[PDB]
Amino acid sequence: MFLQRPKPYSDESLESFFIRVANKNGYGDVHRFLEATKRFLQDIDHNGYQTFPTDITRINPYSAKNSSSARTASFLKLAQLTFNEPPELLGLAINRTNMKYSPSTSAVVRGAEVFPRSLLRTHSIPCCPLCLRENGYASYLWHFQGYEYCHSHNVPLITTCSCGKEFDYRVSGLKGICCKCKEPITLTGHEAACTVSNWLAGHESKPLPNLPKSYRWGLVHWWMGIKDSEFDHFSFVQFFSNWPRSFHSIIEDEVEFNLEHAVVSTSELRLKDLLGRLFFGSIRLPERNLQHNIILGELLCYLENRLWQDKGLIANLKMNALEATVMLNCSLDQIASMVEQRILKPLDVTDYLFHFGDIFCLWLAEFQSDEFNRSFYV
Amino acid sequence: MFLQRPKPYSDESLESFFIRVANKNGYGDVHRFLEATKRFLQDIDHNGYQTFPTDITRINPYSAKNSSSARTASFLKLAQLTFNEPPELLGLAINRTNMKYSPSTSAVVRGAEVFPRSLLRTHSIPCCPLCLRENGYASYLWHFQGYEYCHSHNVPLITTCSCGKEFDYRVSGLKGICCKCKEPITLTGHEAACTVSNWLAGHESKPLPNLPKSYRWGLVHWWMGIKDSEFDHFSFVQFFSNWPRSFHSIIEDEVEFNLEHTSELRLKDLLGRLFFGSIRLPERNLQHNIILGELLCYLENRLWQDKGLIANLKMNALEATVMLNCSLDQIASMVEQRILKPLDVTDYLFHFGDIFCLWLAEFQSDEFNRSFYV
Ligand SMILES: [Zn+2]
Ligand SMILES: [Zn+2]
Ligand SMILES: [Zn+2]
Ligand SMILES: [Zn+2]
């Protein structure tokens, strides 16, 4: 099998890539192209040729249950032999990863952008009938929640055509011709999400900060837990006009509430009981790089400064051997090694034996890194 | 107690900070200030006042046995109480850190710059008396080997004066007046170390790459294991001078010594020195750990060449966690569900053509990922 590469684009999705290859090389559709792709992998002695799907829906590496390792091994072999010039297809596929958010939100990766798994769309993919006729391809941002508006047009994406039927570009082509009435879809102008859709594109909008593509998705899963609802876009804009003093407006509310509503005495207080929501909700977004995770990197500033104010209230919060490992970015064995030789002053892991100012000052002298340290937010 | 901040600098050592305070504010030497400082912590009931040193040698937080957590806890109080405008003292200390190098070298950290533990000077700190008269304070680079020449005057660093006696700023102040002679010290041109110490400082100097301060210092440990000797400043410049074909020139010769010394060949038997000595130096940022990405770019275009020679090189489950940056529990999890294909942990049932395809599918990150060396 000898193919030709179409016009390359760094923002084209994976499902939009196989459609443009089959239309350029004279194939009928994408279903007959993936069937001939499976036939070529059988002839070249591939290990997972029988697991290659013929559907454009499950062509992504996260849809594979156990054959994910043979999926990109099939993707790497096609880029080296079936084209005159080697394309870039591994950077366009959504790969799984072991990276988690706080407290337990899973995440995936696509090249140099770590996507949240919880913000991935799986029911219906929206699209735009303008970019599919001007750019000639589909954006990779159409598969995720949050990119509700088209970024440089001040229009939303479409979900249902004028005759009651939906349009999905994966099953009905990249032109924009719907299934039932075979017409182009009529469109259905704010700023509250046009600021967001410009910012979730990876681009600059003020006052929202300059961050990598992964670390702008990290604010979105966090801010949904703030409202305890779905994402609100205009309150996202107004919240960072007072950055960080709207986040300073939050932590003042959160320590002053749970001291009132403390059920135990002020010496028997725990870190999870005063600040179990704020501190355990910003650790890995996606990592502990406080140079880009500005949430925890600011949270540390409003924790270190007031430590020994108010009789050392914050610096004396009880902690387990469990949540000592969460803050230090270590394991339970390194806690159990520092109770033998007593670098760390004191085993039951779930019995509250430690203090917060003890664990906070241990990080600053024994457990920093080139990203998770005190010297970026200062 | 109530003091004054001097002119604050972005390269002052920590030992120079307790002399520029102790001279200015009416103490006799550095010993008097440390003795006064320890008592102060007793009055405000700090827990580790009894571990606070009266020696300026052991002032750094790695010199503590168990009280390194209470030494920066002693340091987190003085910047808030005993001054007018808070000085930067935690940004000057040499803290420990857990960032292991290749193969097992530990690390220390001073703010946002991580150093090899094996490159710390401990006998006698060389210095430049021209910075000890015009700047008058001690640059933190003087605490480390690899830095031999002063990069601000192109003049060497002194270790033994004209009377056969040494010189150190922790015992002879910051003026430059020695012990035996109490004179100005008589001084002691190259380029090969001059441009390294300009690169070791944190400026842009060619042909040494634009790496960060954590990664400009991760290479000097790596090259001394290559030559297996003391550090030659001449060859460390000329090694980077023909990138990539000087770095590849050892690589294509590493295989030829180890091909002759074919399926029972291993990745530890054929590419064992280049790969296992380059994973974390200090970390896995392939934008700035250029050693792995260029070797991966060498070995991505060598995966199924030579009838798949490099695809047939054997790996364990222990040395697969070194690559994939995971634990042994996730390795045994991929054996039950059978994503990675062949329990004995040190078993040779895993090959390099099998591991590298799994990392492009299930184990990327934002820094240990293919998205830089494309
Ligand atoms: Zn567009
Ligand atoms: Zn229509
Ligand atoms: Zn000088
Ligand atoms: Zn002398």
Author numbering:
A (entry chain J): 1 to 188, 193 to 350, 360 to 391
B (entry chain I): 1 to 188, 193 to 265, 270 to 350, 360 to 391
How did the manuscript describe this experimental structure?
Support for this concept has emerged from recent functional studies on type I-F and type V-K effectors involved in sequence-specific DNA transposition, thereby significantly broadening the potential biological applications of CRISPR–Cas technology. Here we report cryo-EM structures of a V. cholerae type I-F CascadecrRNA in complex with transposition subunit TniQ before (binary CascadecrRNA–TniQ) and after (ternary CascadecrRNA–TniQ–dsDNA) target double-stranded DNA (dsDNA) binding at an average resolution of 2.9 Å and 3.2 Å, respectively.
Our CascadecrRNA–TniQ–dsDNA ternary complex contains a G–G/C–C PAM (protospacer adjacent motif) sequence, which is required for binding of the target sequence, allowing CRISPR–Cas systems to discriminate between self and non-self. The target sequence contains 12-base pair (bp) of PAM-proximal duplex DNA and 51-bp of PAM-distal duplex DNA. We could observe only 5-bp of PAM-proximal duplex DNA with 2-nt overhang at the 3′ end of the non-target strand (NTS), and a traceable 32-nt target DNA strand complementary and paired to 32-nt spacer RNA, but no clear density for the PAM-distal duplex segment, which is adjacent to bound TniQ. The G–G/C–C PAM is specifically recognized by Ser127 and Asn246 in Cas8. Notably, the binary and DNA-bound ternary CascadecrRNA–TniQ complexes superpose with an RMSD of 2.33 Å. Minimal conformational changes are observed on ternary complex formation in the presence of bound target DNA, reflecting slight opening of the entire complex and crRNA, especially within the TniQ-bound end.
